[PDB]
Design brief:
The chain has 119 residues and is an alpha/beta fold. It has four helices and five strands. It has a five-stranded mixed beta sheet. Keywords: Disulfide bond, Electron transport, Redox-active center, Transport.
Length: 119
């Protein structure tokens, strides 16, 4: 098992479609970290999300999307209004989310609670 797993960037809406089709084949959820590079809490959360991703290696794939870099159509799929927003998707749709803007460890514990409900 790795100690940290890097989040995979989502390129566009078509990539999200392929990601969700792959997740459906495996009967697994996915996590998407919707972030911005100017957002201090997003940046500080990254290493802690990568350690959490390693805990779920082979069980849940973790992705990220930079809301200023990706196409607007992809951001609309997420229905994002604040960053960081950590969403759990399963069966082709967003099932639940966590909004950051707190200390990173505490965001992770809330994300873990969300994961445990749906995995």
């Amino acid at each position: 098992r790795p100690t940290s797993v890097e989040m995979e960037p989502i390129d566009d809406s078509h990539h999200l479609d392929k990601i969700l089709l792959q997740a459906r084949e495996l009967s697994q959820p996915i996590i998407i970290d919707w972030m911005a590079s100017w957002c201090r809490k997003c940046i500080y959360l990254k290493p802690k999300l990568e350690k959490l991703a390693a805990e779920y290696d082979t069980k849940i794939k973790f992705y990220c999307a930079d809301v200023n870099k990706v196409p607007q159509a992809l951001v609309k799929r997420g229905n994002i209004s604040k960053m960081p927003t950590i969403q759990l998707w399963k069966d082709g749709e967003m099932k639940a989310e966590v909004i950051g803007g707190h200390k990173a460890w505490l965001v992770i514990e809330e994300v873990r609670e969300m994961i445990q409900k749906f995995v």
